[PDB]
Amino acid sequence: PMKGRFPIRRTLQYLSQGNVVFKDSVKVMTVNYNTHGELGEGARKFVFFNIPQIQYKNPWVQIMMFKNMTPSPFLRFYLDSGEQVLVDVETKSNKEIMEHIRKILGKNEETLREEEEEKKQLSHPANFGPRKYCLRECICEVEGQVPCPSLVPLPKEMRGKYKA
């Protein structure tokens, strides 16, 4: 079987289940947590289960972790403007931390839908080209248009050999 505890964490489906897409302001995220102590328990799970998803959805955001440097667990976000956002996570569950960070620094669903609609415009359906970019290669694939000579030989009258 897959090595380690909770191997589901190392699947692309789980990594893509993350729901936090940070705004463009967030550059760095430091996660200070304690290996022991019940009060930081949720924070530990946040490191165990949710940091991979956050990083997968935010590849260009620096995420760095620190252990047993302060009595309490906390998150700090550094923004492009120089503003710093501190989120105390002691006594919180990892779901609460995820929801809080999504609320305060995550792109809302409307902005994500707008981005998806903007993406859709790039792949214009009417454009003809390679399958890698277009639905169809050539107009010959459209029903009712003159078909490709590979499949249907063209009548003798429209071919240059018998027009010359």
Number of residues that bind ligand FES (CB under 6 A): 5
Stretch that binds ligand FES, among 26-34, 50-58, 80-88, 134-142 (CB under 6 A): 134-142
Max distance between CA atoms of the chain, in angstroms, equals 92
Residue 140 touching ligand FES (CB under 6 A): yes
At residue 44, φ and ψ (nearest 5 deg) are -60, -45
Residue 155 touching RNA (CB under 7 A): no
Whether the CB-CB separation of 35 and 85 falls below 8 Å is answered with no
* Residue 119 CB, nearest approach to RNA (Å): 13
* Residue type present at position 98: M
How many residues would you count in the chain?
164
At residue 52, φ and ψ (nearest 5 deg) are -55, -40
Which residues contact RNA (rule: CB under 7 A)? 1-5, 7, 10, 35-36, 67-68, 127, 129-130, 132-134, 148-151, 153-154, 159-161, 164
